[PDB]
Design a protein around this nucleic acid. Structure first.
Ligand code: CL
Ligand code: CL
Length: 152
RNA sequence: GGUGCCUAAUAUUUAGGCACC
């Protein structure tokens, strides 16, 4: 198992559960726009959360789509970041749980969920490679080692 | 077979399409 392999095996695993990582720049700006919509306790359907993040993301990142942002929203939902108000005959509304209404706390949950998908897929990826994959630098290895230890 | 993307749904997930290998 070389790195170019583990990275393509990691991203395919992620997309297999209907989730997505748009690269370290765009994913960071995607999460922030999710926080911009939700940090005040506003309650948005998937559809309105997607339109909000897509429309603001588009001018800097033209590849942003309802599908690609749906997949990022699915990653947060799969990480159990949302309070979901279920009503009859209507779309469920999503709020950010009180504990995940800041970027640091939301991002930790996001990183953790990608690591659980690596483990579900039997992928064994060291922290230097994690730092690279999620942040595009080597400045997050400890962060990553912290999430790996919690999950084991 | 496999990947990638697009469209749709109240999705801890589905369903459909195209492209490429
Ligand atoms: Cl409400
Ligand atoms: Cl809450």
């Amino acid at each position: 198992q070389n790195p170019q392999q583990l990275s393509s095996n990691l991203w395919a695993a992620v997309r297999a559960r209907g989730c997505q990582f748009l690269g370290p720049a765009m994913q960071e700006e995607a999460l922030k726009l999710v926080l911009l919509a939700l940090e005040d306790g506003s309650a948005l359907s998937r559809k309105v959360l997607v339109l909000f993040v897509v429309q603001r993301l588009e001018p800097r990142f033209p590849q942003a789509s309802k599908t690609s942002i749906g997949h990022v929203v699915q990653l947060l939902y799969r990480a159990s970041c949302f309070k979901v108000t279920k009503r009859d005959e209507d779309s469920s509304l999503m709020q950010l749980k009180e504990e995940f209404r800041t970027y640091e706390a939301l991002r930790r949950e996001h990183d953790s969920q990608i690591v659980q998908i690596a483990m579900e897929a039997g992928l064994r990826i060291a922290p230097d490679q994690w730092s690279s994959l999620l942040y595009g630098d080597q400045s997050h290895k400890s962060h990553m080692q912290s999430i790996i230890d919690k999950l084991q």
